[PDB]
Scaffold this active site. Structure first.
Site, PDB file in Angstrom:
ATOM      1  N   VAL A 152       0.802  -1.206   0.000  1.00  0.00           N
ATOM      2  CA  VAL A 152       0.000   0.000   0.000  1.00  0.00           C
ATOM      3  C   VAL A 152       0.851   1.280   0.000  1.00  0.00           C
ATOM      4  O   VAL A 152       0.333   2.383  -0.161  1.00  0.00           O
ATOM      5  CB  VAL A 152      -1.000  -0.006   1.186  1.00  0.00           C
ATOM      6  CG1 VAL A 152      -0.281   0.109   2.534  1.00  0.00           C
ATOM      7  CG2 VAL A 152      -2.010   1.118   1.027  1.00  0.00           C
ATOM      8  N   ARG A 212       5.351   2.945   0.224  1.00  0.00           N
ATOM      9  CA  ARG A 212       6.767   2.762   0.438  1.00  0.00           C
ATOM     10  C   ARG A 212       7.438   4.078   0.817  1.00  0.00           C
ATOM     11  O   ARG A 212       6.866   5.159   0.691  1.00  0.00           O
ATOM     12  CB  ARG A 212       7.433   2.149  -0.812  1.00  0.00           C
ATOM     13  CG  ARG A 212       7.187   2.888  -2.134  1.00  0.00           C
ATOM     14  CD  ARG A 212       7.462   1.991  -3.349  1.00  0.00           C
ATOM     15  NE  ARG A 212       8.720   1.236  -3.230  1.00  0.00           N
ATOM     16  CZ  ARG A 212       9.274   0.525  -4.212  1.00  0.00           C
ATOM     17  N   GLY A 213       8.660   3.982   1.299  1.00  0.00           N
ATOM     18  CA  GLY A 213       9.420   5.183   1.623  1.00  0.00           C
ATOM     19  C   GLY A 213      10.881   4.828   1.609  1.00  0.00           C
ATOM     20  O   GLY A 213      11.236   3.686   1.298  1.00  0.00           O
ATOM     21  N   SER A 216      11.314   1.764   4.166  1.00  0.00           N
ATOM     22  CA  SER A 216      10.299   0.727   4.356  1.00  0.00           C
ATOM     23  C   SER A 216       9.524   0.401   3.106  1.00  0.00           C
ATOM     24  O   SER A 216       9.470   1.204   2.189  1.00  0.00           O
ATOM     25  CB  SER A 216       9.280   1.166   5.417  1.00  0.00           C
ATOM     26  OG  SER A 216       8.471   2.245   4.936  1.00  0.00           O
ATOM     27  N   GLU A 217       8.933  -0.795   3.097  1.00  0.00           N
ATOM     28  CA  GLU A 217       7.823  -1.134   2.205  1.00  0.00           C
ATOM     29  C   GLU A 217       6.671  -1.497   3.131  1.00  0.00           C
ATOM     30  O   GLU A 217       6.855  -2.237   4.105  1.00  0.00           O
ATOM     31  CB  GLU A 217       8.140  -2.320   1.267  1.00  0.00           C
ATOM     32  CG  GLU A 217       9.447  -2.215   0.487  1.00  0.00           C
ATOM     33  CD  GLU A 217       9.500  -1.019  -0.453  1.00  0.00           C
ATOM     34  OE2 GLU A 217       8.601  -0.890  -1.321  1.00  0.00           O
ATOM     35  N   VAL A 218       5.497  -0.950   2.833  1.00  0.00           N
ATOM     36  CA  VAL A 218       4.341  -1.077   3.719  1.00  0.00           C
ATOM     37  C   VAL A 218       3.211  -1.853   3.035  1.00  0.00           C
ATOM     38  O   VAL A 218       2.787  -1.511   1.910  1.00  0.00           O
ATOM     39  CB  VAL A 218       3.852   0.306   4.224  1.00  0.00           C
ATOM     40  CG1 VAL A 218       2.715   0.147   5.229  1.00  0.00           C
ATOM     41  CG2 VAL A 218       5.004   1.080   4.864  1.00  0.00           C
ATOM     42  N   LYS A 263       4.847  -2.467   8.401  1.00  0.00           N
ATOM     43  CA  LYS A 263       5.954  -1.685   7.851  1.00  0.00           C
ATOM     44  C   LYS A 263       7.219  -2.544   7.975  1.00  0.00           C
ATOM     45  O   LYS A 263       7.732  -2.748   9.069  1.00  0.00           O
ATOM     46  CB  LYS A 263       6.066  -0.343   8.597  1.00  0.00           C
ATOM     47  CG  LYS A 263       7.162   0.602   8.114  1.00  0.00           C
ATOM     48  CD  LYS A 263       7.209   1.879   8.951  1.00  0.00           C
ATOM     49  CE  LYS A 263       8.407   2.757   8.557  1.00  0.00           C
ATOM     50  NZ  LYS A 263       8.517   4.026   9.328  1.00  0.00           N
ATOM     51  N   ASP A 320      10.211  14.940  10.333  1.00  0.00           N
ATOM     52  CA  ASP A 320       9.975  14.535   8.939  1.00  0.00           C
ATOM     53  C   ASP A 320       8.551  14.850   8.539  1.00  0.00           C
ATOM     54  O   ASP A 320       7.872  14.020   7.917  1.00  0.00           O
ATOM     55  CB  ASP A 320      10.299  13.038   8.734  1.00  0.00           C
ATOM     56  CG  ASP A 320      10.602  12.671   7.250  1.00  0.00           C
ATOM     57  OD1 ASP A 320      10.833  13.573   6.398  1.00  0.00           O
ATOM     58  OD2 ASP A 320      10.617  11.456   6.948  1.00  0.00           O
TER      59      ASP A 320
HETATM   60  N1  ATP Z   1      -0.846   3.389   8.900  1.00  0.00           N
HETATM   61  C1  ATP Z   1      -0.850   3.504   7.544  1.00  0.00           C
HETATM   62  N2  ATP Z   1      -1.979   3.413   6.777  1.00  0.00           N
HETATM   63  C2  ATP Z   1      -1.922   3.551   5.421  1.00  0.00           C
HETATM   64  N3  ATP Z   1      -0.769   3.736   4.729  1.00  0.00           N
HETATM   65  C3  ATP Z   1       0.423   3.829   5.389  1.00  0.00           C
HETATM   66  C4  ATP Z   1       0.442   3.724   6.852  1.00  0.00           C
HETATM   67  N4  ATP Z   1       1.732   3.834   7.262  1.00  0.00           N
HETATM   68  C5  ATP Z   1       2.477   4.006   6.154  1.00  0.00           C
HETATM   69  N5  ATP Z   1       1.704   4.009   5.044  1.00  0.00           N
HETATM   70  C6  ATP Z   1       2.212   4.186   3.662  1.00  0.00           C
HETATM   71  O1  ATP Z   1       3.571   3.732   3.585  1.00  0.00           O
HETATM   72  C7  ATP Z   1       4.444   4.832   3.292  1.00  0.00           C
HETATM   73  C8  ATP Z   1       5.773   4.635   4.003  1.00  0.00           C
HETATM   74  O2  ATP Z   1       5.536   4.539   5.412  1.00  0.00           O
HETATM   75  P1  ATP Z   1       6.455   5.445   6.379  1.00  0.00           P
HETATM   76  O3  ATP Z   1       6.364   6.885   5.945  1.00  0.00           O
HETATM   77  O4  ATP Z   1       6.129   5.070   7.804  1.00  0.00           O
HETATM   78  O5  ATP Z   1       7.901   4.813   5.990  1.00  0.00           O
HETATM   79  P2  ATP Z   1       9.315   5.551   5.633  1.00  0.00           P
HETATM   80  O6  ATP Z   1       9.989   4.511   4.769  1.00  0.00           O
HETATM   81  O7  ATP Z   1       9.999   5.774   6.999  1.00  0.00           O
HETATM   82  O8  ATP Z   1       8.986   6.972   4.908  1.00  0.00           O
HETATM   83  P3  ATP Z   1       9.936   8.313   4.711  1.00  0.00           P
HETATM   84  O9  ATP Z   1      10.617   8.072   3.382  1.00  0.00           O
HETATM   85  O10 ATP Z   1       9.070   9.604   4.704  1.00  0.00           O
HETATM   86  O11 ATP Z   1      10.929   8.278   5.853  1.00  0.00           O
HETATM   87  C9  ATP Z   1       3.692   6.045   3.768  1.00  0.00           C
HETATM   88  O12 ATP Z   1       4.086   7.245   3.118  1.00  0.00           O
HETATM   89  C10 ATP Z   1       2.248   5.680   3.441  1.00  0.00           C
HETATM   90  O13 ATP Z   1       1.896   5.927   2.073  1.00  0.00           O
HETATM   91 MG    MG Z   2       7.646   8.267   5.394  1.00  0.00          MG
END
Ligand code: ATP
Ligand code: MG
Ligand code: MG
EC number: 2.7.11.1
Length: 371
Positions: free
Chosen positions: A46, A48-49, A52-54, A69, A195
Site C-alpha cells: 500500500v 513505500r518510503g 520501508s515497504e508497507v 511496515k 519529517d
Molecule cells: N498506517 C498507515 N496506513 C496507510 N498507509 C500507510 C500507513 N503507514 C504508512 N503508510 C504508507 O507507507 C508509506 C511509508 O511509510 P512510512 O512513511 O512510515 O515509511 P518511511 O519509509 O519511513 O517513509 P519516509 O521516506 O518519509 O521516511 C507512507 O508514506 C504511506 O503511504
Molecule cells: Mg515516510
C-alpha cells in the site's frame, strides 16, 4: 561541538529533565520481538518510503485491518528509537495536551529576547492531538527472513498529489489544524518529529480522519543537545539544517508544517524546490531574502558551510507575488499570508509554536466549530 551561540526550545524546554532514562533512553531498551507473523495475514503493498515497504493486512484474532511496515536495513538503534517514540506517545495515560493550560509551564525559555516572540494569540484549550498520532499495535520479526516489522493502525489514504488539489479552503484549515494538534502533543511529550511532510500525513477524507505517521526520524529533545542535520528530506529542511546549526528544537517541525502549508495554499509543489542541497538553500533565500538571512547568521554567529559562498544577493519576495487566479481561492486573504509569514522564518526562535499557530485568526472558523 559546532555551535557558537547556544539555543533552547521556546516551549516545553525541560520535558526530558522532568522525564527520566526509562522514557527517553532508547539505546538501552531491548526489543521484545514476536517470533511469528502467525497472528497476521499479509496482503498487498500500500506504500513505500526511504526506509520501508508497507503492506496492508488483517489482525486475525480481531479481524482489524492493519498495515505492516517492513524495515529496510538501518542501524539497530534507529529501530529502537522509532519503537520507543511510538510507545511513549501511545502509552501516555494522561496526554499533557488534555490538561488545563499552564502558561508558566509552557513558555519555559525565560531569555528576554526569546520572550518577545510570545504571540498575543494562543490556543489555550485542552485538545485531543494525541488521537492524531498513528497507533503501533505490534512488533514482529520473521524467523526465516529476519525482517524487522512494525504493525500499525490502517488508514485509508490517497496520495496527496491526488487529494490536495480537491480540498476546499475550509478543508485545508481543518486538516492543518488536526496536524498542529498532533505536533503540539508530541512536542509536549519532549519529541521532535523531524519529517513532517504530506507522505507522512495519512488522511481518510471521507472520515475527516488525519494521522501523523513515520516516527523513524523522530528524536527526544534534550536542552543544548547538538543533533545531526542530515534528517528530513531536502524540500522540507529548515534553514538550521542547511547551515548546520545543530542545536535545534521542536520549531524545526513548524518550518516543515509551514513549507507543506505554503505548497497547498499557493499550489507550487514542492514550495522550495532545490535541485541539490546547495540549491535548496538558494531556493529559500530567493524567497525570504538575503538581508534577513545575514541577520540570522549574525544572531547565532554561524559560519556558513563552504558550498554557499556562490550565493547571489536576493531581494525578499513578498508573499503577494505567489497569488494568482489558480490559487486565489486559498491564498486571497490576509490571514493565510500572515500565518505563512510567521511560520517560514530563518530564526527558529521567531516561528510560531504549534499552540500559537492554532490560535492564529486563520483557524477561527475551525475553532468556532469546536464547542
Ligand atoms: N498506517 C498507515 N496506513 C496507510 N498507509 C500507510 C500507513 N503507514 C504508512 N503508510 C504508507 O507507507 C508509506 C511509508 O511509510 P512510512 O512513511 O512510515 O515509511 P518511511 O519509509 O519511513 O517513509 P519516509 O521516506 O518519509 O521516511 C507512507 O508514506 C504511506 O503511504
Ligand atoms: Mg515516510
Ligand atoms: Mg510547538
Amino acid at each position: 561541538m559546532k555551535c557558537r551561540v547556544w539555543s533552547e526550545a521556546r516551549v516545553y524546554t525541560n520535558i526530558n529533565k522532568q522525564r527520566t532514562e526509562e522514557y527517553w533512553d532508547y539505546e538501552n531498551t531491548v526489543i521484545d520481538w514476536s517470533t511469528n507473523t502467525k497472528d497476521y495475514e499479509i496482503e498487498n503493498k500500500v506504500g513505500r518510503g526511504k526506509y520501508s515497504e508497507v503492506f496492508q493486512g488483517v489482525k486475525l484474532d480481531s479481524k482489524v485491518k492493519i498495515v505492516i511496515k517492513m524495515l529496510k536495513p538501518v542501524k539497530k538503534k534507529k529501530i529502537k528509537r522509532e519503537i520507543k517514540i511510538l510507545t511513549d506517545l501511545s502509552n501516555e495515560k494522561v496526554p499533557p495536551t488534555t490538561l488545563p493550560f499552564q502558561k508558566d509551564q509552557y513558555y519555559t525559555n525565560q531569555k528576554e529576547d526569546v520572550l518577545k516572540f510570545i504571540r498575543p494569540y494562543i490556543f489555550d484549550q485542552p485538545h485531543n492531538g494525541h488521537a492524531n498520532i498513528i497507533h503501533l499495535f505490534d512488533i514482529i520479526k520473521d524467523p526465516i527472513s529476519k525482517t524487522p516489522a512494525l504493525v500499525f493502525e490502517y488508514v485509508d489514504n490517497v496520495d496527496f498529489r491526488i487529494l490536495y488539489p480537491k480540498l476546499t479552503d475550509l478543508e485545508i484549515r481543518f486538516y492543518m489544524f488536526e496536524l498542529l494538534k498532533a505536533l503540539d502533543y508530541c512536542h509536549s511529550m519532549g519529541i521532535m518529529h523531524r519529517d513532517v511532510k504530506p507522505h507522512n500525513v495519512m488522511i481518510d477524507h471521507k472520515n475527516k480522519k488525519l494521522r501523523l505517521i513515520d516516527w523513524g526520524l523522530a528524536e527526544f529533545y534534550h536542552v543544548n543537545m547538538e543533533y545531526n542535520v542530515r534528517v528530513a528530506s531536502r524540500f522540507f529542511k529548515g534553514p538550521e539544517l542547511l547551515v548546520d546549526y545543530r542545536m535545534y528544537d521542536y520549531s524545526l517541525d513548524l518550518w516543515s508544517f509551514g513549507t507543506m502549508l505554503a505548497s497547498m495554499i499557493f499550489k507550487r509543489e514542492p514550495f522550495f524546490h532545490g535541485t541539490s542541497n546547495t540549491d535548496q538553500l538558494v531556493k529559500i533565500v530567493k524567497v525570504l531574502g538575503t538581508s534577513d538571512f545575514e541577520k540570522y547568521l549574525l544572531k547565532y554567529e554561524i559560519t556558513l558551510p563552504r558550498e554557499f559562498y556562490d550565493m547571489d544577493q536576493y531581494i525578499r519576495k513578498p508573499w503577494h507575488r505567489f497569488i494568482n487566479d489558480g490559487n486565489k481561492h486559498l491564498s486571497g486573504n490576509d490571514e493565510i499570508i500572515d500565518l505563512i509569514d510567521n511560520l517560514l522564518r530563518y530564526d527558529h526562535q521567531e516561528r510560531l509554536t504549534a499552540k500559537e499557530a492554532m490560535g492564529h485568526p486563520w483557524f477561527a472558523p475551525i475553532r468556532e466549530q469546536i464547542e
